[PDB]
Assembly symmetry: C2
Homo-oligomer: 270 residues x 2
Protein backbone atom coordinates (compact mmCIF):
# COMPACT_ATOMS: atom_id res chain seq x y z
CA UNK A 1 0.00 0.00 0.00
CA UNK A 2 1.19 3.50 -0.89
CA UNK A 3 0.50 4.45 2.74
CA UNK A 4 3.53 2.56 4.08
CA UNK A 5 5.62 3.64 1.10
CA UNK A 6 4.98 7.35 1.61
CA UNK A 7 5.58 6.93 5.32
CA UNK A 8 8.90 5.19 4.62
CA UNK A 9 9.83 8.05 2.27
CA UNK A 10 8.98 10.75 4.80
CA UNK A 11 10.81 8.89 7.54
CA UNK A 12 13.99 8.43 5.47
CA UNK A 13 13.93 12.06 4.38
CA UNK A 14 13.60 13.34 7.93
CA UNK A 15 16.37 10.99 9.08
CA UNK A 16 18.53 12.15 6.14
CA UNK A 17 18.15 15.82 7.11
CA UNK A 18 19.16 15.03 10.70
CA UNK A 19 22.20 12.91 9.78
CA UNK A 20 23.64 15.07 6.99
CA UNK A 21 24.69 18.70 7.62
CA UNK A 22 25.13 19.88 4.04
CA UNK A 23 22.08 18.86 2.01
CA UNK A 24 21.95 19.06 -1.79
CA UNK A 25 19.31 21.79 -1.57
CA UNK A 26 21.72 23.67 0.69
CA UNK A 27 24.77 23.03 -1.51
CA UNK A 28 22.88 23.79 -4.75
CA UNK A 29 21.96 27.27 -3.55
CA UNK A 30 25.70 27.80 -3.08
CA UNK A 31 27.22 26.28 -6.24
CA UNK A 32 25.26 27.35 -9.29
CA UNK A 33 22.96 29.59 -7.29
CA UNK A 34 22.65 33.11 -5.91
CA UNK A 35 22.16 33.90 -2.21
CA UNK A 36 24.24 37.09 -2.11
CA UNK A 37 25.57 36.32 1.38
CA UNK A 38 28.44 34.22 2.75
CA UNK A 39 30.02 32.98 -0.48
CA UNK A 40 32.54 30.08 -0.61
CA UNK A 41 36.28 30.68 -0.52
CA UNK A 42 37.52 29.59 -3.94
CA UNK A 43 40.62 27.39 -3.91
CA UNK A 44 41.79 27.63 -7.53
CA UNK A 45 45.54 27.99 -7.04
CA UNK A 46 48.49 26.91 -4.92
CA UNK A 47 48.53 30.29 -3.20
CA UNK A 48 44.75 30.44 -2.81
CA UNK A 49 44.82 27.07 -1.07
CA UNK A 50 47.49 28.28 1.33
CA UNK A 51 45.47 31.31 2.41
CA UNK A 52 42.44 29.03 2.49
CA UNK A 53 43.99 26.98 5.28
CA UNK A 54 44.28 30.03 7.53
CA UNK A 55 40.87 31.54 6.79
CA UNK A 56 38.54 28.55 7.08
CA UNK A 57 37.59 25.98 9.73
CA UNK A 58 40.49 23.54 9.30
CA UNK A 59 41.55 20.82 11.74
CA UNK A 60 44.60 18.91 10.53
CA UNK A 61 47.83 20.88 10.13
CA UNK A 62 49.31 24.31 9.34
CA UNK A 63 50.03 25.63 5.79
CA UNK A 64 53.79 25.40 5.17
CA UNK A 65 55.53 24.33 1.95
CA UNK A 66 59.22 23.45 2.28
CA UNK A 67 60.08 19.79 1.69
CA UNK A 68 57.76 19.16 4.63
CA UNK A 69 54.29 17.77 3.93
CA UNK A 70 53.51 18.88 0.38
CA UNK A 71 50.18 20.24 -0.89
CA UNK A 72 48.99 17.10 -2.69
CA UNK A 73 49.33 14.88 0.39
CA UNK A 74 47.80 17.54 2.62
CA UNK A 75 44.84 17.53 0.24
CA UNK A 76 44.63 13.73 0.11
CA UNK A 77 44.64 13.48 3.92
CA UNK A 78 41.95 16.14 3.94
CA UNK A 79 39.44 14.11 1.95
CA UNK A 80 40.32 11.17 4.20
CA UNK A 81 39.41 13.09 7.35
CA UNK A 82 36.09 14.29 5.96
CA UNK A 83 35.54 10.72 4.74
CA UNK A 84 35.78 9.24 8.22
CA UNK A 85 33.27 11.87 9.26
CA UNK A 86 30.88 10.95 6.45
CA UNK A 87 31.15 7.29 7.39
CA UNK A 88 29.77 8.07 10.86
CA UNK A 89 27.00 10.20 9.39
CA UNK A 90 26.06 7.39 7.00
CA UNK A 91 26.25 4.77 9.73
CA UNK A 92 23.78 6.82 11.79
CA UNK A 93 21.51 7.21 8.79
CA UNK A 94 21.63 3.44 8.20
CA UNK A 95 20.33 2.65 11.66
CA UNK A 96 17.21 4.69 10.85
CA UNK A 97 16.25 2.53 7.85
CA UNK A 98 13.40 0.32 9.11
CA UNK A 99 14.67 -3.21 9.71
CA UNK A 100 18.37 -2.41 9.45
CA UNK A 101 19.17 -2.70 13.15
CA UNK A 102 17.26 -5.98 13.26
CA UNK A 103 19.61 -7.65 10.82
CA UNK A 104 22.39 -9.97 11.99
CA UNK A 105 25.10 -7.65 13.43
CA UNK A 106 27.78 -9.07 11.10
CA UNK A 107 25.55 -8.27 8.13
CA UNK A 108 25.02 -4.70 9.34
CA UNK A 109 28.79 -4.21 9.48
CA UNK A 110 29.22 -5.91 6.10
CA UNK A 111 26.53 -3.76 4.44
CA UNK A 112 28.11 -0.57 5.79
CA UNK A 113 31.67 -1.63 4.98
CA UNK A 114 30.89 -2.13 1.27
CA UNK A 115 28.23 0.51 0.85
CA UNK A 116 29.81 3.60 2.40
CA UNK A 117 32.11 4.29 -0.57
CA UNK A 118 29.25 4.08 -3.06
CA UNK A 119 27.27 6.44 -0.85
CA UNK A 120 30.16 8.87 -0.33
CA UNK A 121 30.50 9.46 -4.09
CA UNK A 122 26.75 9.66 -4.57
CA UNK A 123 26.40 12.48 -2.02
CA UNK A 124 29.63 14.06 -3.23
CA UNK A 125 27.85 14.75 -6.53
CA UNK A 126 25.46 16.99 -4.59
CA UNK A 127 28.44 19.20 -3.79
CA UNK A 128 29.81 19.22 -7.34
CA UNK A 129 29.27 20.81 -10.73
CA UNK A 130 31.22 20.53 -13.99
CA UNK A 131 33.68 23.13 -12.60
CA UNK A 132 34.29 22.13 -8.97
CA UNK A 133 33.39 20.71 -5.57
CA UNK A 134 32.24 22.43 -2.37
CA UNK A 135 34.48 21.91 0.64
CA UNK A 136 34.32 22.52 4.38
CA UNK A 137 30.59 22.57 5.22
CA UNK A 138 30.13 24.51 1.99
CA UNK A 139 32.38 27.29 3.24
CA UNK A 140 34.78 26.50 0.42
CA UNK A 141 35.03 25.60 -3.25
CA UNK A 142 37.94 23.76 -4.84
CA UNK A 143 37.94 23.99 -8.63
CA UNK A 144 38.20 20.99 -10.94
CA UNK A 145 41.20 22.63 -12.62
CA UNK A 146 43.32 22.82 -9.47
CA UNK A 147 42.51 19.25 -8.39
CA UNK A 148 43.29 17.94 -11.86
CA UNK A 149 46.71 19.64 -11.82
CA UNK A 150 48.09 17.90 -8.73
CA UNK A 151 50.98 15.41 -8.99
CA UNK A 152 50.69 12.51 -11.44
CA UNK A 153 49.10 10.18 -8.81
CA UNK A 154 46.83 12.70 -7.09
CA UNK A 155 45.79 14.44 -10.31
CA UNK A 156 43.41 11.82 -11.71
CA UNK A 157 41.93 11.19 -8.27
CA UNK A 158 38.82 13.39 -8.38
CA UNK A 159 38.39 13.47 -12.17
CA UNK A 160 36.37 10.24 -12.45
CA UNK A 161 34.06 11.54 -9.71
CA UNK A 162 33.44 14.78 -11.61
CA UNK A 163 32.52 12.75 -14.70
CA UNK A 164 30.13 10.60 -12.69
CA UNK A 165 28.67 13.65 -10.90
CA UNK A 166 28.00 15.45 -14.16
CA UNK A 167 25.97 12.51 -15.40
CA UNK A 168 24.40 11.81 -12.00
CA UNK A 169 23.29 15.43 -11.49
CA UNK A 170 21.65 15.43 -14.93
CA UNK A 171 18.92 13.47 -13.16
CA UNK A 172 18.08 16.49 -11.00
CA UNK A 173 17.22 14.47 -7.91
CA UNK A 174 16.61 16.27 -4.62
CA UNK A 175 17.13 15.25 -1.01
CA UNK A 176 13.79 13.44 -0.65
CA UNK A 177 14.71 11.28 -3.67
CA UNK A 178 18.34 10.78 -2.62
CA UNK A 179 17.34 9.75 0.89
CA UNK A 180 15.54 6.69 -0.48
CA UNK A 181 18.24 5.95 -3.07
CA UNK A 182 20.98 5.85 -0.44
CA UNK A 183 18.95 3.34 1.56
CA UNK A 184 18.54 1.09 -1.51
CA UNK A 185 22.35 1.09 -1.89
CA UNK A 186 22.90 0.05 1.72
CA UNK A 187 20.44 -2.85 1.59
CA UNK A 188 22.06 -4.45 -1.43
CA UNK A 189 22.27 -8.16 -0.75
CA UNK A 190 25.12 -9.08 -3.08
CA UNK A 191 27.86 -7.82 -0.77
CA UNK A 192 30.40 -10.60 -0.15
CA UNK A 193 30.22 -12.47 3.15
CA UNK A 194 26.56 -11.78 4.00
CA UNK A 195 25.10 -14.38 6.36
CA UNK A 196 21.35 -13.85 5.84
CA UNK A 197 20.49 -12.28 2.44
CA UNK A 198 16.72 -12.76 2.63
CA UNK A 199 15.65 -9.93 5.01
CA UNK A 200 18.13 -7.60 3.31
CA UNK A 201 16.51 -8.19 -0.08
CA UNK A 202 13.06 -8.02 1.52
CA UNK A 203 13.84 -4.56 2.88
CA UNK A 204 15.45 -3.28 -0.33
CA UNK A 205 12.38 -4.51 -2.25
CA UNK A 206 10.23 -2.31 0.02
CA UNK A 207 12.74 0.55 -0.38
CA UNK A 208 12.67 0.26 -4.20
CA UNK A 209 8.88 0.38 -4.17
CA UNK A 210 9.17 3.55 -2.09
CA UNK A 211 11.82 5.02 -4.39
CA UNK A 212 9.71 4.33 -7.47
CA UNK A 213 6.57 5.91 -6.05
CA UNK A 214 8.65 8.85 -4.79
CA UNK A 215 10.12 9.51 -8.22
CA UNK A 216 6.71 9.19 -9.88
CA UNK A 217 5.14 11.71 -7.52
CA UNK A 218 8.10 14.09 -7.34
CA UNK A 219 9.00 14.01 -11.06
CA UNK A 220 5.72 13.16 -12.87
CA UNK A 221 7.14 14.53 -16.12
CA UNK A 222 10.31 12.45 -15.92
CA UNK A 223 9.72 9.24 -17.84
CA UNK A 224 11.36 6.14 -16.43
CA UNK A 225 13.54 8.10 -13.94
CA UNK A 226 13.49 5.08 -11.65
CA UNK A 227 15.22 2.95 -14.29
CA UNK A 228 17.82 5.59 -15.19
CA UNK A 229 18.84 6.12 -11.57
CA UNK A 230 19.28 2.39 -10.99
CA UNK A 231 21.53 1.96 -14.01
CA UNK A 232 23.63 4.76 -12.56
CA UNK A 233 24.66 2.14 -10.02
CA UNK A 234 26.88 0.45 -12.62
CA UNK A 235 28.98 3.59 -12.97
CA UNK A 236 29.17 3.98 -9.17
CA UNK A 237 30.54 0.47 -8.62
CA UNK A 238 33.09 1.12 -11.37
CA UNK A 239 34.08 4.45 -9.82
CA UNK A 240 34.60 2.71 -6.48
CA UNK A 241 36.53 -0.25 -7.90
CA UNK A 242 38.74 2.14 -9.86
CA UNK A 243 39.27 4.32 -6.79
CA UNK A 244 40.31 1.59 -4.36
CA UNK A 245 42.72 0.58 -7.14
CA UNK A 246 44.35 4.03 -7.15
CA UNK A 247 44.50 3.94 -3.37
CA UNK A 248 46.93 1.02 -3.68
CA UNK A 249 49.12 2.97 -6.10
CA UNK A 250 49.06 5.80 -3.56
CA UNK A 251 49.62 3.51 -0.58
CA UNK A 252 53.13 3.30 -2.04
CA UNK A 253 53.72 7.03 -1.57
CA UNK A 254 53.51 7.22 2.24
CA UNK A 255 54.18 4.41 4.73
CA UNK A 256 57.44 4.51 6.72
CA UNK A 257 58.42 6.77 9.63
CA UNK A 258 57.53 6.08 13.27
CA UNK A 259 55.65 9.38 13.16
CA UNK A 260 51.91 9.86 12.52
CA UNK A 261 50.81 6.57 14.09
CA UNK A 262 47.49 6.39 15.95
CA UNK A 263 46.39 9.06 13.49
CA UNK A 264 47.20 6.51 10.78
CA UNK A 265 45.33 4.01 12.93
CA UNK A 266 42.14 6.09 12.76
CA UNK A 267 42.25 6.47 8.98
CA UNK A 268 43.70 3.29 7.45
CA UNK A 269 41.90 1.99 4.34
CA UNK A 270 38.69 3.25 5.96
CA UNK B 1 -0.19 3.83 -24.91
CA UNK B 2 0.76 0.49 -23.42
CA UNK B 3 -0.39 -1.00 -26.74
CA UNK B 4 2.56 0.41 -28.66
CA UNK B 5 4.90 -0.97 -26.02
CA UNK B 6 3.53 -4.54 -26.46
CA UNK B 7 3.96 -4.26 -30.22
CA UNK B 8 7.57 -3.20 -29.62
CA UNK B 9 8.05 -6.18 -27.29
CA UNK B 10 6.77 -8.64 -29.90
CA UNK B 11 8.94 -7.07 -32.60
CA UNK B 12 12.11 -7.37 -30.49
CA UNK B 13 11.32 -10.95 -29.39
CA UNK B 14 10.77 -11.86 -33.02
CA UNK B 15 14.15 -10.39 -34.08
CA UNK B 16 15.79 -12.16 -31.16
CA UNK B 17 14.54 -15.59 -32.27
CA UNK B 18 15.70 -14.84 -35.80
CA UNK B 19 19.15 -13.65 -34.72
CA UNK B 20 20.08 -16.16 -32.03
CA UNK B 21 20.22 -19.90 -33.00
CA UNK B 22 20.21 -21.12 -29.42
CA UNK B 23 17.46 -19.55 -27.28
CA UNK B 24 17.23 -19.99 -23.51
CA UNK B 25 14.12 -22.14 -24.03
CA UNK B 26 16.14 -24.59 -26.14
CA UNK B 27 19.03 -24.31 -23.68
CA UNK B 28 16.90 -25.24 -20.65
CA UNK B 29 15.20 -28.06 -22.58
CA UNK B 30 18.61 -29.57 -23.26
CA UNK B 31 19.80 -28.94 -19.68
CA UNK B 32 16.74 -30.18 -17.80
CA UNK B 33 16.86 -33.31 -19.88
CA UNK B 34 13.63 -35.29 -19.72
CA UNK B 35 14.62 -35.63 -23.37
CA UNK B 36 16.17 -38.36 -25.49
CA UNK B 37 16.50 -36.21 -28.60
CA UNK B 38 18.86 -33.47 -27.40
CA UNK B 39 20.99 -34.87 -24.57
CA UNK B 40 24.55 -33.43 -24.78
CA UNK B 41 27.96 -35.07 -24.53
CA UNK B 42 29.59 -34.04 -21.26
CA UNK B 43 33.21 -32.83 -21.13
CA UNK B 44 34.50 -33.12 -17.56
CA UNK B 45 38.13 -34.18 -18.10
CA UNK B 46 40.89 -34.55 -20.70
CA UNK B 47 39.66 -38.00 -21.64
CA UNK B 48 36.09 -36.90 -22.25
CA UNK B 49 37.51 -33.82 -23.98
CA UNK B 50 39.15 -36.21 -26.45
CA UNK B 51 35.99 -38.23 -27.10
CA UNK B 52 34.35 -34.85 -27.66
CA UNK B 53 35.71 -34.24 -31.17
CA UNK B 54 34.25 -37.68 -31.93
CA UNK B 55 30.63 -37.01 -30.94
CA UNK B 56 30.50 -33.29 -31.74
CA UNK B 57 32.73 -31.17 -33.97
CA UNK B 58 35.75 -29.15 -32.87
CA UNK B 59 38.19 -27.55 -35.28
CA UNK B 60 41.12 -28.49 -33.03
CA UNK B 61 42.93 -31.63 -31.87
CA UNK B 62 41.24 -34.74 -30.45
CA UNK B 63 44.33 -36.70 -29.23
CA UNK B 64 47.29 -35.34 -27.26
CA UNK B 65 47.61 -31.55 -26.97
CA UNK B 66 50.81 -30.98 -24.99
CA UNK B 67 53.45 -30.65 -27.71
CA UNK B 68 50.65 -29.85 -30.17
CA UNK B 69 48.71 -26.75 -29.12
CA UNK B 70 47.78 -26.88 -25.43
CA UNK B 71 44.29 -27.81 -24.21
CA UNK B 72 43.71 -24.66 -22.15
CA UNK B 73 44.83 -22.40 -24.97
CA UNK B 74 42.86 -24.59 -27.38
CA UNK B 75 39.63 -24.18 -25.40
CA UNK B 76 40.38 -20.46 -25.10
CA UNK B 77 40.58 -20.17 -28.90
CA UNK B 78 37.21 -21.88 -29.24
CA UNK B 79 35.51 -19.43 -26.89
CA UNK B 80 37.34 -16.75 -28.86
CA UNK B 81 35.87 -17.81 -32.20
CA UNK B 82 32.43 -18.22 -30.64
CA UNK B 83 32.70 -14.70 -29.23
CA UNK B 84 33.22 -12.96 -32.56
CA UNK B 85 30.36 -15.09 -33.86
CA UNK B 86 28.21 -13.83 -30.99
CA UNK B 87 29.29 -10.28 -31.83
CA UNK B 88 27.86 -10.74 -35.33
CA UNK B 89 24.54 -12.15 -34.13
CA UNK B 90 24.15 -9.34 -31.59
CA UNK B 91 25.07 -6.80 -34.27
CA UNK B 92 22.46 -8.33 -36.57
CA UNK B 93 19.95 -8.10 -33.67
CA UNK B 94 21.00 -4.51 -32.90
CA UNK B 95 20.05 -3.41 -36.42
CA UNK B 96 16.44 -4.46 -35.75
CA UNK B 97 16.04 -2.17 -32.71
CA UNK B 98 13.83 0.70 -33.93
CA UNK B 99 15.87 3.85 -34.39
CA UNK B 100 19.28 2.20 -34.03
CA UNK B 101 20.31 2.31 -37.70
CA UNK B 102 19.13 5.95 -37.89
CA UNK B 103 21.66 7.05 -35.25
CA UNK B 104 24.94 8.73 -36.14
CA UNK B 105 27.09 5.90 -37.51
CA UNK B 106 29.91 6.60 -35.06
CA UNK B 107 27.46 6.27 -32.16
CA UNK B 108 26.24 2.98 -33.62
CA UNK B 109 29.84 1.79 -33.42
CA UNK B 110 30.24 3.09 -29.87
CA UNK B 111 27.04 1.44 -28.60
CA UNK B 112 28.06 -1.90 -30.10
CA UNK B 113 31.63 -1.69 -28.81
CA UNK B 114 30.53 -1.12 -25.20
CA UNK B 115 27.38 -3.23 -25.33
CA UNK B 116 28.39 -6.51 -26.97
CA UNK B 117 30.18 -8.18 -24.07
CA UNK B 118 27.57 -7.21 -21.52
CA UNK B 119 25.10 -8.92 -23.86
CA UNK B 120 27.40 -11.90 -24.40
CA UNK B 121 27.52 -12.56 -20.63
CA UNK B 122 23.77 -12.05 -20.20
CA UNK B 123 23.00 -14.57 -22.93
CA UNK B 124 25.73 -16.93 -21.77
CA UNK B 125 23.85 -17.28 -18.46
CA UNK B 126 21.08 -18.90 -20.51
CA UNK B 127 23.45 -21.74 -21.38
CA UNK B 128 24.64 -22.26 -17.80
CA UNK B 129 23.63 -23.93 -14.57
CA UNK B 130 25.73 -24.48 -11.46
CA UNK B 131 27.66 -27.44 -12.92
CA UNK B 132 28.64 -26.22 -16.36
CA UNK B 133 27.87 -24.61 -19.70
CA UNK B 134 26.57 -25.80 -23.06
CA UNK B 135 28.94 -25.67 -26.05
CA UNK B 136 28.78 -26.42 -29.79
CA UNK B 137 25.21 -25.20 -30.32
CA UNK B 138 24.12 -27.34 -27.37
CA UNK B 139 25.57 -30.70 -28.50
CA UNK B 140 28.11 -30.65 -25.69
CA UNK B 141 28.30 -29.61 -22.05
CA UNK B 142 31.57 -28.56 -20.47
CA UNK B 143 31.84 -28.90 -16.69
CA UNK B 144 32.43 -25.89 -14.42
CA UNK B 145 35.00 -27.90 -12.46
CA UNK B 146 36.89 -28.96 -15.60
CA UNK B 147 37.12 -25.33 -16.69
CA UNK B 148 38.37 -24.15 -13.31
CA UNK B 149 41.15 -26.78 -13.43
CA UNK B 150 42.84 -25.35 -16.54
CA UNK B 151 46.36 -23.85 -16.54
CA UNK B 152 47.09 -21.23 -13.87
CA UNK B 153 45.60 -18.22 -15.69
CA UNK B 154 43.02 -19.94 -17.93
CA UNK B 155 41.57 -21.79 -14.95
CA UNK B 156 39.67 -18.72 -13.77
CA UNK B 157 38.33 -17.09 -16.92
CA UNK B 158 34.86 -18.64 -16.56
CA UNK B 159 34.26 -18.82 -12.78
CA UNK B 160 33.07 -15.21 -12.56
CA UNK B 161 30.65 -15.84 -15.45
CA UNK B 162 29.24 -18.85 -13.58
CA UNK B 163 28.87 -16.95 -10.31
CA UNK B 164 26.97 -14.30 -12.20
CA UNK B 165 24.91 -16.82 -14.14
CA UNK B 166 23.59 -18.62 -11.05
CA UNK B 167 22.39 -15.34 -9.52
CA UNK B 168 21.08 -14.04 -12.81
CA UNK B 169 19.18 -17.24 -13.59
CA UNK B 170 17.40 -17.02 -10.22
CA UNK B 171 15.46 -14.17 -11.87
CA UNK B 172 13.90 -16.83 -14.12
CA UNK B 173 13.64 -14.58 -17.16
CA UNK B 174 12.62 -16.04 -20.51
CA UNK B 175 13.59 -15.12 -24.07
CA UNK B 176 10.68 -12.69 -24.39
CA UNK B 177 12.11 -10.81 -21.37
CA UNK B 178 15.79 -11.04 -22.36
CA UNK B 179 15.09 -9.70 -25.83
CA UNK B 180 14.02 -6.31 -24.45
CA UNK B 181 16.71 -6.27 -21.78
CA UNK B 182 19.43 -6.86 -24.37
CA UNK B 183 18.07 -3.92 -26.38
CA UNK B 184 18.12 -1.73 -23.25
CA UNK B 185 21.77 -2.62 -22.73
CA UNK B 186 22.78 -1.56 -26.24
CA UNK B 187 20.96 1.76 -26.13
CA UNK B 188 22.92 3.17 -23.18
CA UNK B 189 23.25 6.93 -23.04
CA UNK B 190 26.20 6.80 -20.65
CA UNK B 191 28.63 5.06 -23.04
CA UNK B 192 32.00 6.85 -23.40
CA UNK B 193 32.43 8.90 -26.58
CA UNK B 194 28.81 9.24 -27.73
CA UNK B 195 28.16 12.29 -29.90
CA UNK B 196 24.35 12.49 -29.77
CA UNK B 197 23.18 11.28 -26.38
CA UNK B 198 19.59 12.57 -26.59
CA UNK B 199 18.30 10.41 -29.46
CA UNK B 200 19.90 7.36 -27.80
CA UNK B 201 18.12 8.04 -24.48
CA UNK B 202 14.78 8.66 -26.19
CA UNK B 203 15.01 5.16 -27.62
CA UNK B 204 16.15 3.56 -24.35
CA UNK B 205 13.33 5.28 -22.47
CA UNK B 206 10.99 3.59 -24.93
CA UNK B 207 12.77 0.25 -24.36
CA UNK B 208 12.67 0.68 -20.57
CA UNK B 209 8.90 1.17 -20.70
CA UNK B 210 8.44 -1.89 -22.94
CA UNK B 211 10.64 -3.94 -20.61
CA UNK B 212 8.81 -2.73 -17.49
CA UNK B 213 5.39 -3.56 -18.92
CA UNK B 214 6.62 -6.93 -20.23
CA UNK B 215 7.88 -7.93 -16.80
CA UNK B 216 4.65 -6.86 -15.09
CA UNK B 217 2.64 -8.93 -17.56
CA UNK B 218 4.99 -11.92 -17.74
CA UNK B 219 5.91 -12.03 -14.03
CA UNK B 220 2.76 -10.80 -12.18
CA UNK B 221 3.95 -12.34 -8.92
CA UNK B 222 7.48 -10.93 -9.12
CA UNK B 223 7.94 -7.82 -6.99
CA UNK B 224 10.27 -5.19 -8.45
CA UNK B 225 11.64 -7.67 -11.00
CA UNK B 226 12.31 -4.64 -13.19
CA UNK B 227 14.50 -3.01 -10.50
CA UNK B 228 16.28 -6.31 -9.76
CA UNK B 229 17.09 -6.92 -13.45
CA UNK B 230 18.47 -3.37 -13.93
CA UNK B 231 20.74 -3.79 -10.86
CA UNK B 232 22.18 -6.86 -12.56
CA UNK B 233 23.61 -4.41 -15.09
CA UNK B 234 26.24 -3.70 -12.42
CA UNK B 235 27.40 -7.30 -12.23
CA UNK B 236 27.76 -7.25 -16.02
CA UNK B 237 30.16 -4.28 -16.09
CA UNK B 238 32.30 -5.94 -13.40
CA UNK B 239 32.50 -9.16 -15.41
CA UNK B 240 33.64 -7.17 -18.45
CA UNK B 241 36.20 -5.06 -16.60
CA UNK B 242 37.53 -8.19 -14.91
CA UNK B 243 37.64 -10.20 -18.14
CA UNK B 244 39.62 -7.35 -19.67
CA UNK B 245 42.25 -7.45 -16.93
CA UNK B 246 42.65 -11.22 -17.31
CA UNK B 247 43.08 -10.84 -21.06
CA UNK B 248 45.99 -8.42 -20.58
CA UNK B 249 47.68 -11.03 -18.36
CA UNK B 250 47.25 -13.80 -20.95
CA UNK B 251 48.49 -11.54 -23.75
CA UNK B 252 51.79 -11.18 -21.88
CA UNK B 253 52.39 -14.72 -20.59
CA UNK B 254 51.43 -16.21 -23.94
CA UNK B 255 53.35 -14.43 -26.73
CA UNK B 256 51.86 -16.95 -29.15
CA UNK B 257 48.28 -16.22 -28.06
CA UNK B 258 46.33 -14.79 -30.98
CA UNK B 259 43.17 -12.70 -30.69
CA UNK B 260 40.70 -11.86 -33.45
CA UNK B 261 40.97 -8.28 -34.84
CA UNK B 262 37.27 -7.72 -34.12
CA UNK B 263 37.55 -8.46 -30.39
CA UNK B 264 40.83 -6.60 -30.13
CA UNK B 265 39.17 -3.55 -31.66
CA UNK B 266 36.22 -3.44 -29.28
CA UNK B 267 38.64 -3.90 -26.37
CA UNK B 268 40.72 -1.02 -27.77
CA UNK B 269 39.37 1.45 -25.20
CA UNK B 270 36.87 0.67 -22.40
C1 LIG C 1 25.01 -12.99 -26.98
C2 LIG C 1 25.30 -13.95 -28.14
C3 LIG C 1 25.70 -15.34 -27.65
C4 LIG C 1 26.95 -15.27 -26.78
C5 LIG C 1 27.48 -16.65 -26.40
C6 LIG C 1 28.72 -16.50 -25.53
C7 LIG C 1 29.39 -17.84 -25.25
N1 LIG C 1 30.54 -17.71 -24.34
C8 LIG C 1 30.77 -16.44 -23.64
C9 LIG C 1 31.86 -16.48 -22.56
C10 LIG C 1 33.21 -15.92 -23.01
C11 LIG C 1 34.37 -16.45 -22.45
C12 LIG C 1 35.61 -15.93 -22.79
C13 LIG C 1 35.71 -14.86 -23.68
O1 LIG C 1 36.95 -14.34 -23.92
C14 LIG C 1 37.36 -13.77 -25.16
C15 LIG C 1 38.80 -13.27 -24.99
C16 LIG C 1 37.31 -14.83 -26.27
C17 LIG C 1 38.18 -16.04 -25.94
C18 LIG C 1 36.49 -12.56 -25.52
O2 LIG C 1 35.56 -12.75 -26.34
O3 LIG C 1 36.76 -11.48 -24.97
C19 LIG C 1 34.56 -14.34 -24.25
C20 LIG C 1 33.31 -14.86 -23.91
C21 LIG C 1 31.21 -18.83 -24.06
N2 LIG C 1 31.02 -19.98 -24.69
C22 LIG C 1 31.76 -20.92 -24.11
C23 LIG C 1 31.92 -22.28 -24.36
C24 LIG C 1 32.76 -23.04 -23.56
C25 LIG C 1 33.45 -22.44 -22.50
C26 LIG C 1 33.30 -21.08 -22.25
C27 LIG C 1 32.45 -20.32 -23.06
O4 LIG C 1 32.10 -19.00 -23.03
Amino acid sequence: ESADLRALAKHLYDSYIKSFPLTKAKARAILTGKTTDKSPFVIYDMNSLMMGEDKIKFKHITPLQEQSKEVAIRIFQGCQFRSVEAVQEITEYAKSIPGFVNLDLNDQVTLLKYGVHEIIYTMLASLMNKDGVLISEGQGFMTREFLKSLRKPFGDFMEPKFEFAVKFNALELDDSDLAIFIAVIILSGDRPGLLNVKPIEDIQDNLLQALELQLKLNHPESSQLFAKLLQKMTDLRQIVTEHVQLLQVIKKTETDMSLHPLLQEIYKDL
